[PDB]
Symmetry: C2
Subunit: 619 residues, 2 copies
């Protein structure tokens, strides 16, 4: 049955075959993206129709294609050729990661730059970095990667410790040409190593940590059926996985008495971008759309018991497509477990004599991905009391540069001569809402201060106000932490027992949004990142805040284009897009490998239930 | 020696003896507050002088006294008679809690009000509520409590379900007189029970929760010596307890290689206020200073193992004085344990082939208190990476009223006829800083956006600015979440290996501050709560942001009086006072007992260390 089940190896093999039998997957075609499409609204009435969507690159310079395949019926639904100058280049291929270095190695300008700095070409690593769109007309319609160099002194050395500043290369990865080499002058290559497993650097390892054992002698309190259907403590959902988005949650619902009450139809991180704030021309083009350009799902780590996920862990091993359409398992790529979460509720009553304490817990669904130097953990949490939460954990090794003599307004010093350019990591959560079903609306809620006077003679009164967002033109909102601003998603046709519409309230962290000048390329390409909250009317083709093809795409698609339709969102099937991020001025403590920092958001029931939903939790 | 050790029963009995001997503690005297004072600045080769401070009330009507005793030397250092109309009343005595109901039960006016509502006086509980300072001139110099009524249908009933609105009384608890009874008219007394252990309301309890077992087979990784000295994962500190503030942390330091580096000299929650936002005369005077008026420490719960604190727990059982100067232990009043805290750092490197994962942990020091309907947990956390965090957990039963027919801008509906007035819970954390010692300064750090143009041609640059707070007059600061504002405490005389002053950065949650009109009584009495950050020059008598005597005390003391001294704070012994709070518009999910909500802050190292301090953590 399960229409939201994870893709199996078989379905992927069959997409490869169907694409073969049908003539679209030659020996020169490469899959840049493959994933199952979600069912249509109201599709549960008719029979299962598993469709997969595919982006196909061509190594022989031919135009790429977007293809939809039906694996259920063994047919092709559509296949269109893409003008990439128009609608964007395909996502970077894993096989292109090595190509920037290989091409530069025999390029005379590059070799000249390395010789001036007395660097052995055999020891120079080149990061394959997304190009974006700037002043270079030659790049339009061409598939470009840019290259920044880092020295690896030996095979096990951390090359990030040795950035080669003042040097950047542009490369065409289809034609296999080097379009430009820019050498603005030599900077000293930082000499200290950053090898965080070298005893010389770590000193003697601590012997003071005694073990902590977390076990469940009767197993976990959640069940997994149909491969990926979870039931836990009144919650019901399906855990999806997509090579672009990573972990995606479907059909988040809560069993309240004898009713399964939908809350969120689909929850995902639909984009994440890392814009850099260093005006040096060596790095001023740097903006990594890890989700849209690189595909974070594909680089999900195989997590290890005791190390990555602690306790009684149930794993999912999602299957994805390699470049040729063969299925590939990411073994132990998703962790699922429950954990204790301190006190849930507590009261000791003088008058009744009753003392009462209950413990909280949360269900955790997580994965961890690695993109070059960065490593990100994505964690979804469901709590006993109906709260839903997302948390990103950022770690890895910070992206480095030289530290200028005389300092910098845009770069931090990490070690002698070693800099870390300022940057942000900004996420977009796409929450296809379904609060008690699909007829939903959003209100912006602010605290309202009141003036001392008639009706408030002691000057103690305070209140709040709610403003319905009625149309998409009114639905691009900013934070206001000072007035306690939140957004409530409600169902105006579903009332609780006090005759008030059922709702969930989104609580943001109110961290800074995109800092770049509004006239910049990145402000246009990551327009979603300039505002905290967006609400659109649901449409099946409006999946990402940056559009389907982000790589080397100017503005023209994504949220600003969707919002322009100015559709009714007052009691309709709607989607909330929440921007949230970390603004990182790297500190010495982040080097040579960074301690986790976090950002996230949560939603809490707001008159969704008729009383506390956790009165039936036992002592 | 340990001069920061917890007060012992013997010391408290000895204080009693000294006071008795001195003629200060005859049969009409009551101890309203008793606490050990911290050692003086300096004090090392100087031997121990354990001094206690005592507030002594007199039940016959005589003026109270403030007394300092040297228990070491058997002497009275100072004893001063207090004019309470000027300097404030002493904190509420536990013995006064019952007095409000007792006196009202035989008052003709109160009895008439109850008879008008067909309520049996035997069933009417009266909350003993702090009075504040309003328009009632006869209250000046008198110890007053105000009384709000709640019906208890039977001994084990939750009275909070049955508020008696439209009625309030004021009582002189020393003369035992009812000064006023105000009845503005009958409201229906809400009829539904709120008995969260009654099977009729909870329904069948869940049988779905499988055990989670947290154990440490080798015991915990921290040690406790001298009764209250903790050593854990390079951290060192002393855990104090005061009847007013509760848990107080002293001498927080970190052992970095061979050197014990101070960070925070003293950390405490020095005040917490709960202002109500309902303009009804029945409650418009309601502002509970749980710390300054009630003394949160004295109501600290005994914490049951496996229920309140889970895992391998080490308890402290602090000793306090009763009303007569006899010692009273709070058994298992403070929990101490370490817990797993997920991933600390992780990187899988493409060039080096090294995959690296480490786990985080935190040390937790906590207590839980109960003040009438409210229950608060105070949690301090120390992390492997140098981060220090505080979290408050708010739970209990919400303070109720009638819900007006036709609704309310200042009260939420919870059940039929039952309301919950809007309010805030606002904390002041007093952090007597000692970043690498006492010579410290504070900078306000904002993100700085840059305009596209010369030097920033692509409009990607962003920066930050730091502004030193040089004198107290410029050290009253507000949040700016939009600009990512934080505050850095540094030592201008202690540099890290990159020649930068060592520091810690305070990260606030940027929740709304005090909402009351600035002309209100509460804005003057809780002036600290109007601004997010204050910095003072350390002084031994500047302990609380509201002064020593808050009960029925107007403005004139506390932080605004301290700041007026305009002292140098630029490389001096300074104290940071951070305001942070929850603004609570109660939801139906909060009833009949509220799920925990949280608020807090953290400080993270900011070039304090010369590189990551957790490179020596093992796999
Ligand atoms: Cu970063
Ligand atoms: Cu509250
Ligand atoms: Na929706
Ligand atoms: Na200080």
């Amino acid at each position: 049955a399960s229409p939201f089940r994870l893709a199996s190896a078989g379905e992927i093999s069959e997409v490869q075959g169907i694409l073969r039998t049908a003539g679209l997957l030659g020996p020169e075609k490469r899959i840049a993206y493959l994933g199952v499409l979600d069912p249509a609204r109201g599709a549960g009435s008719e029979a299962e129709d598993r469709r997969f969507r595919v982006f196909i690159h061509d190594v022989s310079g031919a135009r790429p294609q977007e293809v939809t395949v039906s694996v259920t019926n063994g047919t092709v639904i559509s296949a269109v050729e893409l003008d990439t100058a128009a609608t964007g280049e395909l996502p970077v291929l894993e096989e292109e990661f090595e190509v920037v270095e290989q091409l530069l190695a025999t390029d005379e300008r590059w070799l000249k730059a390395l010789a001036a700095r007395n660097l052995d070409v055999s020891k120079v690593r080149v990061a394959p970095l997304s190009a974006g769109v700037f002043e270079y007309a030659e790049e339009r319609g061409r598939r470009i990667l840019r290259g920044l160099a880092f020295v690896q002194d030996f095979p096990e050395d951390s090359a990030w410790a040795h950035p080669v500043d003042g040097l950047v290369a542009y490369v065409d990865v289809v034609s296999k040409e080097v379009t430009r080499v820019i050498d603005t002058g030599v900077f000293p290559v930082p000499a200290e190593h950053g090898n965080y497993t070298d005893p010389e650097l770590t000193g003697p390892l601590r012997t003071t940590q005694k073990p902590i054992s977390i076990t469940q002698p009767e197993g976990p309190s959640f069940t997994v059926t149909g491969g990926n259907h979870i039931e836990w403590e009144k919650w019901s959902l399906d855990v999806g996985f997509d090579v672009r988005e990573g972990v995606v949650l479907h059909n988040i619902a809560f069993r309240d008495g004898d009713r399964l009450r939908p809350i969120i139809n689909r929850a995902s991180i639909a984009e994440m971008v890392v814009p850099y704030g260093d005006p040096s021309p060596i790095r001023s083009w740097q903006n990594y759309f890890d989700t849209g350009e690189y595909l974070v799902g594909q680089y999900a780590n195989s997590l290890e018991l005791g190390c990555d996920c602690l306790g009684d862990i149930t794993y999912l091993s999602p299957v994805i497509s390699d470049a040729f359409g063969n299925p590939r398992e990411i073994r132990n790529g998703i962790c699922m477990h429950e954990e204790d979460w301190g006190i849930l509720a507590k009261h000791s009553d003088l008058w009744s004599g009753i003392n009462y304490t209950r413990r909280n817990r949360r269900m955790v669904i997580s994965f961890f991905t690695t993109i070059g130097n960065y490593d990100y953990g994505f964690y979804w949490y469901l709590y006993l009391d109906g709260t839903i939460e997302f948390e990103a954990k950022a770690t890895g090794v910070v992206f480095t540069s030289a530290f200028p003599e005389g300092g910098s307004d845009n770069i931090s010093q990490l070690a002698p001569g070693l800099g870390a350019p300022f940057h942000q990591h900004i996420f977009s959560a796409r929450l296809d809402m379904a609060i008690d079903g699909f007829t939903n609306r959003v209100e912006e809620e602010d605290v309202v201060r009141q003036t001392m006077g008639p009706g408030n003679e002691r000057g103690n009164a305070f209140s709040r106000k709610r403003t319905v967002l009625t149309r998409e033109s009114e639905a691009v909102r900013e934070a206001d932490a000072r007035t306690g601003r939140t957004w409530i998603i409600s169902n105006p046709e579903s009332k609780n027992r006090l005759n008030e519409p059922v709702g969930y309230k989104l609580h943001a962290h109110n961290q800074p949004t995109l800092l770049a000048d509004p006239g910049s390329s990145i402000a246009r390409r990551a327009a979603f990142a300039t505002k905290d909250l967006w609400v659109t009317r649901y449409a099946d083709d409006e999946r990402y805040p940056t559009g389907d093809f982000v790589n080397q795409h100017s503005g023209g698609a994504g949220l600003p284009s969707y919002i322009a339709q100015d559709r009714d969102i007052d009691g309709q099937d709607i989607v909330v897009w929440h921007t949230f991020g970390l603004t990182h001025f790297p500190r010495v403590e982040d080097w040579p490998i960074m301690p986790v920092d976090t950002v996230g958001f949560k939603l809490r029931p707001e008159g969704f239930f008729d009383r506390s939903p956790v009165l039936d939790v036992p002592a």
